[PDB]
Amino acid sequence: TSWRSEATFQFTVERFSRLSESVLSPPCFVRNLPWKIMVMPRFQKSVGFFLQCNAESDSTSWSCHAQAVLKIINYRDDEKSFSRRISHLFFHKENDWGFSNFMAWSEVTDPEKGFIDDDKVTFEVFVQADAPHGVAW
Amino acid sequence: GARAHSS
Structure with missing residues (x-):
């Protein structure tokens, strides 16, 4: 269920070499909050990779502590995933x-x-979030 | 893992 305390989800960015704007994955619900992968080019130069949480909500009372593993999949050899x-x-x-x-x-x-194929790169996040505060009262 | 931060 969406109330799960953790989960692993992936997002494949297409036409990667041409990425110019920040891109967001669909949401993955954990602790009933929407989590998303955020990828953006930084300085070509470097790959910006972030985990986003409950960004669309207009609430200013919520908080959720979480630990996560951000990983770029190596399709040829997972031991080479970074x-x-x-x-x-x-x-x-x-x-x-x-x-x-x-x-x-x-x-x-x-x-x-081994990270890119057909100009596609897959990003993965394993998030383990604590119970949130200021959401469900 | 080398100094995580906001986008």
């Missing part, structure tokens, strides 16, 4: 957390590296 962990208290003023320089753009888009 990941970084985060731990953050998400709330309206800090609704996303991650790395602007998650990986070098040149490396992720390198066809010989």
Whole structure:
């Protein structure tokens, strides 16, 4: 159910080499809140990769602490997938957390590296969130 | 994992 305390979801960004704007995945519900993968180019140069939580809500009373593993899938060999962990208290003023320089753009888009195929790159997030505050009273 | 932050 959406009240689950954790989950793993993926989002495949197409026409990756041409990415120019920030892109958002559909939501994955955890602790009944919508979580999304956010990817954006940073300085070509580097891949920006962030985890976003409950960003569309106009509430300013909510908060949810969570730890997560942000990973860029290596389709040729999963042991080569690259990941970084985060731990953050998400709330309206800090609704996303991650790395602007998650990986070098040149490396992720390198066809010989195994992360890109048909100009597509798959992002994955394993999020373990605590019970939120200021949502369901 | 090297200094996580907001977008």
